[PDB]
């Protein structure tokens, strides 16, 4: 009856580890988003790119600022970037390969979000 | 009983769905090692100095395979007849690559 | 099968161990990834010293002089700043002109 | 066979009870999980300090370019107090004049423009400069905090301003 | 068969508890609708 | 439970104003008082802070208040900081050491003394991230007009939207039904096997 043992194992795993893990991850990311939007707003500067963090159904997500021709916006003009709320944003969930080190910048953005919050 | 195996397969499938929906990025970072950013000086390590006639020359350039003359401070061509002796008194007769320079 | 059951149990153990003793959120996993990445970055970057390194320097097209320089390499923009006589000049490792300017000053270090 | 099914049902019921206690707002489970969480967070403090100190070292190396005046003691004004600080020649981290065995010397200001505070900070620069404290790992090993993750603080404010 | 229906009942009840627990987070529309 | 204060824009403004008042503190012969008839708090992590400052020089009080407000909105986006500035009645281009519209509006409290009298006070819901508390302040100052400015700026900063922490934990009631059903179904499977 090893199979019933495995069934019990996976049932306990899911409903006593993964679901509380989902709740804990949502709570931590929501707290980080709250501590981020309580002072900071719109985009912030990380690795010469611009990232913002928004909370959705499946956790927090970082979107990077790009111009019309899918080029990341240089940090120097974040001023006007805060003036224009219709600037193009690309999500970090999709691994888009045209930008060199896009996932690198996304990971550093998440790390900076953790450090600031 | 095949029903028990079906149930445990449903267990592992729903575990995978839960991981993919929520913990996709975390597991992707932890278990899958991402490519490292290329090092331009690692590419430049193969470069070495020699003499193109009476001018300085850089062999072993993957950035530009064509013949290029080394630029001085004011971004102008370098033309010394004695540059070979200077290379011999610093690197040696053999053209020392930038990898050995970094290793120094 | 017995092998399938053993594999399933091992996968159980691995997943439970990860979910208990490892981060389960994007922030902390990204912090660990950034830690490893920055460790590699610095392992490569520390090969460039900031000490006073003697080298032959070409102020013009027919002049040469021996002098001490300082070198600082950064990977955010991938450039080397060379310090001479209290003045710092930045040379990119991706631009052809900057590479042609910087390679002789590095390969001719006495 | 029968015993196996009975124990299967019993273990499923135990797991259901554990899930009920986990999801619900039970004070006992909350106390236990908060105990564990506090212990884990205090454990992770050290790694967080190391990472932040190292990143601040990189940003100090990047910032201290073409500016030899930032390497010497200056009386930085923080709106309410003066601190005589600089950047260390080795770690490239903010290093200020230390007050005994405590933190950096904070010359309290009685007004927006307080000449006496500036005069006393200069006096410390010229006389009592042998005792210094640096943000990062020395700060952690001496006073218990890294200087970062603390607001307001001279390390964080100096990193944000510069 | 009996173990199958036992598993079905347990999984249904535990999934109901998990869904009721996670509704505020898995349904962000619920949280943003009520401010 | 010793929990950290959840920093928030109006809290930062109040604390900066209080620090500026303390660092320019001057003795005065005027009596400044707080009298609250009832204080009711029934929600967890609802910290209450009753700080009783009073500076007789109300002109300097508005100067420091405007300076602290300007330093606070130095981190907001430009459009939001500016619109909140006209909503309050303070202009950034004007020096803080100048009489603004807000001060002119609040001069109507010059005759009344510097006492804060509240008949009854109740603290509402305070949703804070775990490990932190939502702290509410009742700050008195040496003039009722400085108080006027204080509460109007506090309300204006409260008008902003800060995302709330949502509680996903279900209400807990003693679950004897689950164990009862488990026992009944154990008896059921015992009978089935037999």
Curated annotation (Swiss-Prot), chain A:
This protein's source sits in the domain of life called: Viruses
Which keywords are on file for this protein? Disulfide bond, Fusion of virus membrane with host membrane, Membrane, Phosphoprotein, Signal-anchor, Transmembrane, Transmembrane helix, Viral envelope protein, Viral penetration into host cytoplasm, Virion, Virus entry into host cell
The principal location of this protein is virion
Please verify whether the record's keywords include Magnesium. no
Q: Which residues lie on this side of the membrane: Virion surface?
A: 22-117
Please outline how this chain is modified post-translation: Contains two intramolecular disulfide bonds. They are created by the viral disulfide bond formation pathway, a poxvirus-specific pathway that operates on the cytoplasmic side of the MV membranes.
Localization of this protein: Virion membrane
Segments traversing the membrane? 1-21
Taken from the UniProt entry, a GO cellular component term is: membrane
Q: How does it sit in the membrane?
A: Single-pass type III membrane protein
BP terms from Gene Ontology: membrane fusion involved in viral entry into host cell; symbiont entry into host cell
Please give the function described in this protein's UniProt entry: Envelope protein part of the entry-fusion complex responsible for the virus membrane fusion with host cell membrane during virus entry. Also plays a role in cell-cell fusion (syncytium formation).
Name the family the entry cites: Belongs to the orthopoxvirus OPG147 family.
**Assembly and interactions?**
Part of a stable entry-fusion complex (EFC) which is at least composed of proteins OPG143, OPG147, OPG155, OPG086, OPG094, OPG107, OPG104, and OPG099. Formation of the viral membrane is necessary for the assembly of the complex.
User: What is this protein's record name?
Assistant: Virion membrane protein OPG147
* Protein's organism: Vaccinia virus (strain Western Reserve) (VACV)
**The encoding gene:** OPG147
Swiss-Prot record, chain C:
First-listed, main subcellular location of the protein, grouped into a coarse class: virion
Hey, which stretches end up on the Virion surface side?
21-110
Membrane topology recorded in Swiss-Prot or TrEMBL: Single-pass membrane protein
Entry's Gene Ontology BP terms: fusion of virus membrane with host plasma membrane; symbiont entry into host cell
Checking InterPro entries in the record gives: Poxvirus_G3
* Record's GO cellular component terms: membrane; viral envelope; virion membrane
Instruction: List keywords of the entry alphabetically.
Output: Fusion of virus membrane with host cell membrane, Fusion of virus membrane with host membrane, Late protein, Membrane, Signal-anchor, Transmembrane, Transmembrane helix, Viral envelope protein, Viral penetration into host cytoplasm, Virion, Virus entry into host cell
| Residue ranges crossing the lipid bilayer per the database entry | 1-20
Q: According to its UniProt record, how is this protein modified after translation?
A: Unglycosylated because produced in viral factories instead of the classic ER -Golgi route.
Q: Where in the cell is it found?
A: Virion membrane
- Coiled-coil segments on the chain, per record: none
Tell me what induces its expression.
Answer: Expressed in the late phase of the viral replicative cycle.
Keyword Transmembrane, does the record have it? yes
Which family does the record assign?
Belongs to the orthopoxvirus OPG086 family.
Known partners and oligomeric status: Interacts with OPG099/L5. Component of the entry fusion complex (EFC) composed of OPG053/F9, OPG076/O3, OPG086/G3, OPG094/G9, OPG095/L1, OPG099/L5, OPG107/H2, OPG143/A16, OPG104/J5, OPG147/A21 and OPG155/A28. Except for OPG095/L1 and OPG053/F9, each of the EFC proteins is required for assembly or stability of the complex.
Name of the protein: Entry-fusion complex protein OPG086
- Organism in which the protein naturally occurs: Vaccinia virus (strain Western Reserve) (VACV)
Swiss-Prot record, chain D:
Residue ranges, Virion surface compartment?
23-162
Chief localization: virion
How is the protein modified post-translationally, according to the record? Contains two intramolecular disulfide bonds. They are created by the viral disulfide bond formation pathway, a poxvirus-specific pathway that operates on the cytoplasmic side of the MV membranes.
Question: According to its UniProt record, where is this protein located?
Answer: Virion membrane; Host endoplasmic reticulum membrane
The membrane-spanning stretches of this chain are 2-22
What InterPro entries does UniProt report for this protein, alphabetically? Pox_LP_H2
Q: How does it sit in the membrane?
A: Single-pass type III membrane protein
Protein family (similarity comment): Belongs to the orthopoxvirus OPG107 family.
Q: Which named protein is this?
A: Protein OPG107
- The species is Vaccinia virus (strain Western Reserve) (VACV)
Gene that codes for this? OPG107
From Swiss-Prot, chain F:
Give any Gene Ontology cellular component: virion membrane
Q: Where in the cell is it found?
A: Virion membrane
**Protein family membership:** Belongs to the orthopoxvirus OPG053 family.
Q: How does it sit in the membrane?
A: Single-pass membrane protein
| Main localization (coarse) | virion
- Give the gene symbol: OPG053
Q: What induces it?
A: Expressed in the late phase of the viral replicative cycle.
Post-translational modification (record): Disulfid bonds are oxidized in the cytoplasm by OPG088 protein.
Subunit composition and interactions: Component of the entry fusion complex (EFC) composed of OPG053/F9, OPG076/O3, OPG086/G3, OPG094/G9, OPG095/L1, OPG099/L5, OPG107/H2, OPG143/A16, OPG104/J5, OPG147/A21 and OPG155/A28. Except for OPG095/L1 and OPG052/F9, each of the EFC proteins is required for assembly or stability of the complex.
Mark the transmembrane ranges: 175-194
Q: Which domain of life is it from?
A: Viruses
Q: Which UniProt keywords apply?
A: Disulfide bond, Late protein, Membrane, Transmembrane, Transmembrane helix, Viral envelope protein, Virion
The name of this protein is Entry-fusion complex associated protein OPG083
Q: Which segments sit on the Virion surface face?
A: 1-174
């Amino acid at each position: 009856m090893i199979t019933l043992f495995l069934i019990l194992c996976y049932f306990i795993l899911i409903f006593n580890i993964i679901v509380p893990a989902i709740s804990e991850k949502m709570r931590r990311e929501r707290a980080a988003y709250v501590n981020y939007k309580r002072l900071n707003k719109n985009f912030i500067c990380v690795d010469d790119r611009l990232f913002s963090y928004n909370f959705t159904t499946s956790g927090i997500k970082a979107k990077v600022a790009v111009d019309n021709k899918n080029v990341p916006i240089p940090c120097s003009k974040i001023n006007e970037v805060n003036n224009n709320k219709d600037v193009d944003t690309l999500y970090c969930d999709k691994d888009r390969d045209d930008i060199p080190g896009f996932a690198r910048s996304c990971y550093r953005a998440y790390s900076d979000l953790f450090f600031t919050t | 009983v095949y029903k028990h195996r079906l149930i445990v397969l449903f267990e592992v499938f729903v575990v995978f769905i839960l991981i993919y929906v929520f913990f996709r990025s975390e597991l992707n970072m932890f278990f899958m090692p991402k490519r490292k950013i290329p090092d331009p000086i690692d590419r430049l390590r193969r470069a070495n100095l020699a003499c193109e006639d009476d001018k300085l020359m850089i062999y072993g350039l993957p950035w530009m395979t064509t013949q290029t003359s080394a630029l001085s401070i004011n971004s102008k061509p370098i033309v010394y007849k004695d540059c070979a002796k200077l290379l011999r008194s610093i690197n040696g007769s053999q053209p020392v690559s930038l990898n050995d320079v970094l290793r120094r | 099968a017995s092998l399938l059951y053993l594999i399933l149990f091992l996968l159980f153990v691995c997943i439970s161990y990860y979910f208990t003793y490892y981060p389960t959120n994007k922030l902390q996993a990204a912090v660990m990834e950034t830690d490893r990445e920055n460790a590699i970055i610095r392992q490569r970057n520390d090969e460039i010293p900031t000490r006073t390194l003697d080298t032959a320097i070409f102020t013009d097209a027919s002049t040469v002089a021996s002098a001490q320089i300082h070198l600082y390499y950064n990977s955010n923009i991938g450039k080397i700043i060379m310090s001479l006589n209290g003045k710092k000049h930045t040379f990119n490792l991706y631009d052809d002109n900057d590479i042609r300017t910087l390679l002789p000053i590095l390969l001719l270090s006495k | 066979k029968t015993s196996t099914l009975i124990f299967f049902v019993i273990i499923l019921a135990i797991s259901a009870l554990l899930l009920w206690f986990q999801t619900s707002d039970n004070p006992v489970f909350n106390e236990l999980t908060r105990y564990m969480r506090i212990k884990n967070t205090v454990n992770d403090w050290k790694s967080l300090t190391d990472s932040k100190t190292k990143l601040e070292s990189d940003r100090g190396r990047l910032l201290a370019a073409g500016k030899d005046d930032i390497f010497e003691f200056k009386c930085v004004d923080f709106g309410a107090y003066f601190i005589a600080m600089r950047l260390d020649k080795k770690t490239y981290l903010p290093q200020a004049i230390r007050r005994g065995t405590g933190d950096a010397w904070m010359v309290k200001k009685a007004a927006k423009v307080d000449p006496s505070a500036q005069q006393f900070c200069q006096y410390l620069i010229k006389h009592k400069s042998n005792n210094v404290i640096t943000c990062g790992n020395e700060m952690l090993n001496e006073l218990g905090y890294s200087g970062y993750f603390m607001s307001p603080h001279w390390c964080s404010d100096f990193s944000n301003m510069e | 068969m009996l173990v199958v229906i036992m598993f079905f009942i347990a999984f249904a009840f535990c999934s109901w508890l998990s869904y009721s627990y996670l509704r505020p987070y898995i349904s962000t529309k619920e949280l943003n609708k009520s401010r | 439970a010793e929990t950290k204060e959840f920093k928030t824009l109006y809290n930062l403004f109040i604390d900066s104003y209080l620090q500026k008042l303390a660092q320019h503190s001057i003795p005065t012969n005027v009596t400044c008082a707080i009298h609250i008839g009832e204080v009711i708090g029934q929600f967890k992590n609802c910290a209450l802070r009753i700080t009783n400052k009073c500076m007789s020089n109300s002109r300097l009080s508005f100067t420091l208040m405007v300076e602290s407000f300007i330093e606070v909105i130095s981190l907001l986006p430009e459009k939001d900081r500016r619109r909140i500035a006209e909503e309050i009645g303070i202009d950034l281009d004007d020096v803080p050491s100048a009489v603004s519209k807000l001060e002119k509006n609040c001069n109507a409290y010059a005759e009344v003394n510097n006492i804060i009298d509240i008949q009854k006070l109740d603290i509402g819901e305070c949703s804070a991230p775990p490990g932190q508390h939502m702290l509410l302040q009742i700050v008195n100052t040496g003039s009722a007009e400085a108080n006027c400015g204080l509460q109007t700026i506090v309300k204006s900063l409260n008008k902003i939207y800060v995302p709330p922490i949502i509680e996903n934990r279900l209400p807990y009631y003693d679950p004897w039904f689950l164990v009862g059903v488990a026992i009944i179904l154990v008896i059921f499977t015992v009978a089935i096997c037999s």
